[PDB]
Write a protein that binds this ligand. Sequence first.
Ligand SMILES: CCCCOc1ccc[n+](CC(P(=O)(O)O)P(=O)(O)O)c1
Ligand SMILES: CCCCOc1ccc[n+](CC(P(=O)(O)O)P(=O)(O)O)c1
Ligand SMILES: [Mg+2]
Ligand SMILES: [Mg+2]
Ligand SMILES: [Mg+2]
Ligand SMILES: [Mg+2]
Ligand SMILES: [Mg+2]
Ligand SMILES: [Mg+2]
Lengths: 359, 358
Amino acid sequence: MPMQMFMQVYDEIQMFLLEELELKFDMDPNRVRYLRKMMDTTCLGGKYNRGLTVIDVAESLLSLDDGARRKRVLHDACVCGWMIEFLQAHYLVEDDIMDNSVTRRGKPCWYRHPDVTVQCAINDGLLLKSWTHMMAMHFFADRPFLQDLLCRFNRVDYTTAVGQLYDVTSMFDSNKLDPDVSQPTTTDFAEFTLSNYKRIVKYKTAYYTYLLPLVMGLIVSEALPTVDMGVTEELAMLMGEYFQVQDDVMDCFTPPERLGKVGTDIQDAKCSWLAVTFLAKASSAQVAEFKANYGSGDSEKVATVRRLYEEADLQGDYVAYEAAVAEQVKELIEKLRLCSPGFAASVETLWGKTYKRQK
Amino acid sequence: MPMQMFMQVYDEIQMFLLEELELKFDMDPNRVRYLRKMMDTTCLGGKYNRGLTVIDVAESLLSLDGARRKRVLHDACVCGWMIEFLQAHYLVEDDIMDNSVTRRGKPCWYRHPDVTVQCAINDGLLLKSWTHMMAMHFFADRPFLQDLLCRFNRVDYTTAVGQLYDVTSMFDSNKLDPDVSQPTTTDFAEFTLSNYKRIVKYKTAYYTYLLPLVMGLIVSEALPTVDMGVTEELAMLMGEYFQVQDDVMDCFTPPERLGKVGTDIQDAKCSWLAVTFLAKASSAQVAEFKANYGSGDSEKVATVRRLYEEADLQGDYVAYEAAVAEQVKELIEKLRLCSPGFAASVETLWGKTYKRQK
Ligand SMILES: CCCCOc1ccc[n+](CC(P(=O)(O)O)P(=O)(O)O)c1
Ligand SMILES: CCCCOc1ccc[n+](CC(P(=O)(O)O)P(=O)(O)O)c1
Ligand SMILES: [Mg+2]
Ligand SMILES: [Mg+2]
Ligand SMILES: [Mg+2]
Ligand SMILES: [Mg+2]
Ligand SMILES: [Mg+2]
Ligand SMILES: [Mg+2]
């Protein structure tokens, strides 16, 4: 049922976008055809956690009628859902390029498709982002909440690109960060700290993945101030950090077939949860062998890093991590429940889709 | 004068953005420094015609206290920087898409020794996001914010649509299929003036000509006073001519004057020169073009250039330029009737465009 509606609104949105292109942007059938495939490939095939969370929060805050309100709020919630899913699609298109990934959701990355050049793919990503603004303006033209909705969406979007900068520069000595001078990947790994890890993940993931679906659900249902926002943000940040930790762990240990995408973290010398957690507790010997093997495409070097992780009991650390998180989450959810029972339930439901995801 | 204050608002915007990053986004001094340099390198060193136009339109319209003049002109500077940052964003990504080497006498952003191509794509995105951040900050309390951001975003989308038209213009559109690789076009049957005019209207005309005019009008609280049909006609015309000029210069202007290395021939681009040549060429000439276009090879590039010079493209260009100046004049007069001050600012814009040696 939630999926049923969400996919009707996908049709509505696509229809509005591609037709507008044909009618007002002189677009030929072939390019409308290209863009329809692009849109389907890039936006569809995920679990839609972000999109569906907007619907669920809206519905939960509805009680605060001929049903006309319900029709309206839930349809606005579906559109906001797609705004975040299209924002996500944009990020993944560009991120697969930045990360030199090969596949995504069991398909080749968009930029890796035979008839998609890297240059078009960059622009297709840009198109994805612009469609978020185009759909909002079409559907929310007459809504009092439009300006606030767009202000917040835009803030989070900026936040996410700021986090991406943290991610993409995390393997380079920041003191030597300088446009005019080339610099290799870090050799001492001095900045692969848990502190620098939490900052990357808070900004690149937590805001758009957890805070924004919640905020949008609250905006469309006109209930944003009914909620302790300090507690709501604590929750989003924590759940968002945990989600990315899971993403990192899965990159290394989850078989590609379940994962859908091949893991690039070790080869990209990424500042992952695994690397920072290993380096903090490792012996000098272990640090040496890590440094000898990280950040190379070589297959046995990557298999050494995996053994080192297993030998250092990182799966054990993860279990302990997960348990600390779940306890914090539970405590914050009850704090929410006191004056926002409906919302706390939608947050519980979001947690259900996150906690111990086999994904 | 307009230049001095425009640069004063730049420092104000820069200080707001970088300070916000340190205070609210947990940014370290090292990355702030990288971002300051990025912002300077990508946003400064051009002519600022887009930005300066907003100020000039704003000033031309403040009749049709003195704190209002200070506020309207400050608002016009911020809008100017919005379009300049939007442009910076475009040029960062465009240089990557186009495989360009220099821009404004320096390496393109993504060619800087300490800029990875991956970071460059993202820096481009930061550039776009800064347009929104600056508007939200300076115009928070301004009744025109929603309308401003709506038109801004629409022009932004229009431009990315034109970029698609540009980047897919050398591929047979009948065989556009994500699942199947295709080489560049070999018959060039889609290199038409028609197809050319569409690329150019969308990729350049809207953000380069219409957006600065619109923004100047918005901050002047004077948008409904002008004929928008006529204003758009001018913008599209002025915008097409500007791009034609950009195309010609790519091929015939010494890099030193331009600041950049021409990639149009190499990238098999649907340039004004290409479509204009192909439309008038003999079959023998078309053949020579076909064997020489879209290749990095030095001598093939210089074959294409000679083919252009021999086909009197420079006469075609003079004639087109004349026809444009003719259509432009008439539209400005029509605009001058009900909107005298706006027409003047449009005429000043045309002055910065007509026969530019840029
Ligand atoms: C312009 C902002 C782009 C933000 O991109 C992101 C943010 C968060 C997550 N991802 C995709 C992740 P994925 O590639 O799916 O493993 P990762 O590259 O972070 O591991 C991409
Ligand atoms: C996402 C939209 C990107 C638009 O990029 C553009 C649009 C218009 C002009 N330019 C730069 C031009 P330039 O590279 O300066 O000669 P060109 O690449 O069109 O020849 C770049
Ligand atoms: Mg990735
Ligand atoms: Mg990434
Ligand atoms: Mg990952
Ligand atoms: Mg270019
Ligand atoms: Mg280009
Ligand atoms: Mg050019």
